[PDB]
Design a protein around this nucleic acid. Sequence first.
DNA 1: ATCAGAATCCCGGTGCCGAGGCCGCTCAATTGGTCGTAGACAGCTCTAGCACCGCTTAAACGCACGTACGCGCTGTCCCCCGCGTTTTAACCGCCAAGGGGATTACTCCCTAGTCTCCAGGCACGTGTCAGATATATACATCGAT
DNA 2: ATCGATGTATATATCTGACACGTGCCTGGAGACTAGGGAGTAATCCCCTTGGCGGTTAAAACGCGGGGGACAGCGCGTACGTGCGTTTAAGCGGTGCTAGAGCTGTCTACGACCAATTGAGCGGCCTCGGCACCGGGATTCTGAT
Lengths: 328, 74, 93, 93, 80, 78, 97, 97, 105, 104
Amino acid sequence: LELRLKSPVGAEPAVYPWPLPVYDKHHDAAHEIIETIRWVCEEIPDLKLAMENYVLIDYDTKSFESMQRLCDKYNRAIDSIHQLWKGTTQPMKLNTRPSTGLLRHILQQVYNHSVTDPEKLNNYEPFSPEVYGETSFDLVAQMIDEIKMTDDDLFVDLGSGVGQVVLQVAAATNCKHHYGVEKADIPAKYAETMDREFRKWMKWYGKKHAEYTLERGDFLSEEWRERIANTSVIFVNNFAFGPEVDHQLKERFANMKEGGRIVSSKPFAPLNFRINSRNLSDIGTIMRVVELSPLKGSVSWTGKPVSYYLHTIDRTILENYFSSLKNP
Amino acid sequence: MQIFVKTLTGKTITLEVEPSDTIENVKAKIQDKEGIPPDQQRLIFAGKQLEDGRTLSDYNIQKESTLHLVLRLR
Amino acid sequence: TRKESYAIYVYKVLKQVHPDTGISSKAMSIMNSFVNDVFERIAGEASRLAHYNKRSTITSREIQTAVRLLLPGELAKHAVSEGTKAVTCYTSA
Amino acid sequence: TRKESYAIYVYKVLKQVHPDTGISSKAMSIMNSFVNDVFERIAGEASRLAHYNKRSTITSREIQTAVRLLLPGELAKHAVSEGTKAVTCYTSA
Amino acid sequence: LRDNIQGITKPAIRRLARRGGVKRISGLIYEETRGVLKVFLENVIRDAVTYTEHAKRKTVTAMDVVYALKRQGRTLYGFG
Amino acid sequence: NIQGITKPAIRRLARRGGVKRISGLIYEETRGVLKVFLENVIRDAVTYTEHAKRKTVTAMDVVYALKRQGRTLYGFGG
Amino acid sequence: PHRYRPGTVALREIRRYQKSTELLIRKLPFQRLVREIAQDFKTDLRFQSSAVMALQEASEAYLVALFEDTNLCAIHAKRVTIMPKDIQLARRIRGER
Amino acid sequence: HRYRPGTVALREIRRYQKSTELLIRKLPFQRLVREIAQDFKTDLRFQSSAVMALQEASEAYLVALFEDTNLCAIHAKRVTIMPKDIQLARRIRGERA
Amino acid sequence: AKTRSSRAGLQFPVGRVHRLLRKGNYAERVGAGAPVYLAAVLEYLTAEILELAGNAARDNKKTRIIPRHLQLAVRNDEELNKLLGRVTIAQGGVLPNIQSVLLPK
Amino acid sequence: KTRSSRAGLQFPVGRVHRLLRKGNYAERVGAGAPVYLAAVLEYLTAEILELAGNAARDNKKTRIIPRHLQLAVRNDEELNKLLGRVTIAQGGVLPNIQSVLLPK
DNA sequence: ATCAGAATCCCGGTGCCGAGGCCGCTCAATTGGTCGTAGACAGCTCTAGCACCGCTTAAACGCACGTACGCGCTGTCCCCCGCGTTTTAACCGCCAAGGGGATTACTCCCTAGTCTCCAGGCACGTGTCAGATATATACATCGAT
DNA sequence: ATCGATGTATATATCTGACACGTGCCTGGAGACTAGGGAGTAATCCCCTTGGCGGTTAAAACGCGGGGGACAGCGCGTACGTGCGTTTAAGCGGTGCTAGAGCTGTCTACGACCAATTGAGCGGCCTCGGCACCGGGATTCTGAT
């Protein structure tokens, strides 16, 4: 006694048993099928015409067969698409990237079906690097708008959580391989299932992501001294790591080369930094700090919006100060 | 012999040494014409990092050859 | 009478941050009176913190938590951090 | 484990003013926390008048001029007189 | 824990104003005072917690809050 | 003496504060505020000078009055 | 039935409340407020049950002083009704942020 | 020619908020202080800088006062300051009872 | 007697104050007139309040002093209020104080 | 070796270590404590002279005068809140005018 | 609006003076160098903070009513502003004064220290009288009829 | 206006509990005696404050004229108050759990004192270059047109 959704791209179907389980307050597998038919009709335009016909309001989540009724009407229409693709109609593009409306559906589907218990994401010791804190849906999609990435570029997160910042970036651009390094335990135990389902949820919806891995262990292990020195783009949530934990990140940031861009909550370096013979040790001599625009309509616990600060390793200034001590 | 020191910033200096000189006397003479703090200077010869008391004759860099300078932050 | 002040030490710290700037003899006496006043506020609290634990020694630890009371939010974040490194540097020497 | 107070002394002072009156234990621990506060202003003022005049002592002359500063007008004018009587009465006896 | 600042009710602030002598309250004061009471408590508690961390304890006694208000300039009699 | 504090000088102070238009009964108000204020300072200033067994009010005795007042002054040798 | 005129009720509260001494804010909603603010400075802090009574006493005696000095201002502007550009005024004059 | 009333005064502000010099002469203020010190003790000599310190205080106390006074009068929909305001502004600080 | 309290005719313990000036690091050397002259001043201020509380308690016809009385003691005075203008008294209350225009016409 | 050079300070460590003993601020003093204290005072007098120097160029002057400290302090909102009670000699106030006083 | 009309910036020159190097002489800062005693971990123990939970019920809450009060506008009456003439005292320079502050000295008598003595103050202890609840009159007042 | 009843004032008695009084038990107050050391006074000192002249030259003072502003008031639309029903959620007191606060244990490394040596710091010398000042120029608003 289950519910079946036939794959529009010919992959293995996703089966959800009855009764349909509840993941959290606002994302459950019963309503998730309503959006699944809603977003897959956005995928195949001929499939959208099949659900404009004869799909009336009168279907409810309490009834099994009535939820099955739209599902059985979906399963009849997928067979109409696959026989249409065998003729002169070209198939849907498989190697494309999911749009933000479809990256809305897939990642939350990975967030729900992999991470069963979100309460276990909150079992930590506070005021520590073990403090769990995730990112909003828009601000990572804001970085997709505002920050340019390529294949020589490599997006690696520090303290990824369940890793949805890498997931929203590895699906966005084409970096060669990603790392999400996790000192926390319980979102890393979910990251094994976040890795399995998401690679499968790019099979069922049929889009492309980049190569990624969410890794458990130490980001302050001494292997990652040069592995950070291999990284181009580094995301870090330094609100409550502790500054000596951030100072040991400043140890690993002494070995980074040109073009490194760090997007972080608490500034390593002030916006109004100035180089003099007192702050020769400080980190603002080599990177410029600019504040990315915090989200409109987003109030945090303090009352100010969450500020992530764009950096850029630019060693231009440091020789210029050394030149302007000769000058005049 | 004279050597050439090519940096990461595109700027290359024309610095004149002896073939027997130590890097410490070079890093002092880099502090002459460039004034960059030698305790924040970091030199590389071709995968062999220059150490202070070590010479050129330890490393046997040829005349009119190319070095690499890195700006380390203390 | 040979009187003491901090008149020379501020002049060194001025040349670290601005070599091309001097400081006149009126606005020297402000910075002389200033450091004589911030020292009395901080070394006032280390008197008050020791009695409350009924101890009789100002360690380096009371100054660290006298500063986190007495200065504002943002400014105390650097000054505590600037202090620890100087003790750290003092430990190797 | 001793924990002192000024509690028994107010019972003497209360009965010599209103002998037909009592006092609750709530408003007892106000008057215990009042004398501890008036002390540490007066005893905390002679700490400055000793060192503003480069001295090391505390006579009954500093304590007289610590009361002059702290208490307001008509109240200061009696408390100096009530004190100096008890210096002289301790003196001749 | 989240959002207990609505727990200070609308008739609570109403009771406080009548002790001061307010005959007639407007309607927007109830969102002002929930801002005034929060900012006042963030300066008392921050100092009192900082006394606790110096003593190497986890328990905040009544003789920490009094040493927070005394330094603040609001000396409290009656709790030791 | 307090009469000697003029009419335009109080008009010179209030322009520093940002006042644009001044009434007429301010001029015996602000003489009255000032005459209070010095009776708090000098009474404390004299009481330090009484204690030092002197008759010459130094610069320090005015500064120690204003510290104790909570009106701390920088720039006279604190 | 009967109706009091508007205003005659509140004048009877002011005479009633200015004689009483009990804490006008309730005991327990206030305690879930103090533990929440103290949550974001250090976690796992145990409050004595006499230290929570300290914060309730000192936070009424601040706010009563606020509404006394609110109410000198609204009468000063010939009004009777207190408005939030009085509370933002009085904290500006006392020198607060 | 003729200025509008109130056009010079917006220039007298800008002239005085850029300057540093003492706005109350030296000589009558000094003869004021020797009055008030006479009621406490006779034959008190003042150092030259010990009157300067009073003049740095008594200006910078009054200049602070008219800043706080002018906040009151704008609050009451006026421009003109009046002696109910100095009696108000000195009251909220608690410097008056 | 052998007590220094009764040799001066005081109540407050003159021996204790001579200790508390020492173990407080107020100064090094404590003169002989210092505890005796001080402890008289403490006696006068506390007797000043319990008089004025006693005049306000018996007009409320009660036996003991409760802290509602001490609030009425200080706040109805001129010179105790200027000293204790930075004091919050626990469970005190405020004065009866209604402004001019708030009374009904 | 001094004891400022052994930790990289410019402020003295002799003068501070003495003044904790002349004051009776406590009985005995920990040995790393006057180091920590002179670390702070350096940072605060490198904080003022930083904001002093910027605002001194705008008047195209070379030396620092007491008007420049007054403009360094009341502008910064983290030194204003520390130095709230203190008047500064020869200072003056910030150039600031109300909104309703500007003409039409 | 566009002129015009003084204000004030701002400057190109120079002239006094005070800040920035320079000297040198002394006294506080560093050194050992040994010690004693305050402090740190260790262990233990009961203290009350915490969790919680059923049970009555005072306390918020939602809403309908309506009236008194914030608010906008008008004006009108006159107070401040601005300007121009007229007068006083601040101001600088001044010089002479001489009192009082400042440092040295000299020695004394008060304070600390130590050992000693004991009893007043403190915590338990039982006993008791002020009070608060619970109700019952007593007053008197506020708005309608 | 006086009903009127509502809220408040005062009063009744009584069982609860909160001091008020006693035991004796324990570290601090008191004596005194001895040693040293800061403080009192004298003695002079050389500055720096009071004092008063004399002329200049801004600044205060007088006055009057025009008008923008505060003041009293009306109108009118609405938002805040009072009351009645309704519904959570504190408050109680109940019981257990245990984390941890507090006290002692028990040795100890850290800091102080004494003495040794001397280099950094301060006072007085010079002196330059920065602003003060000057009298000249562009620029910027104010008000009338």
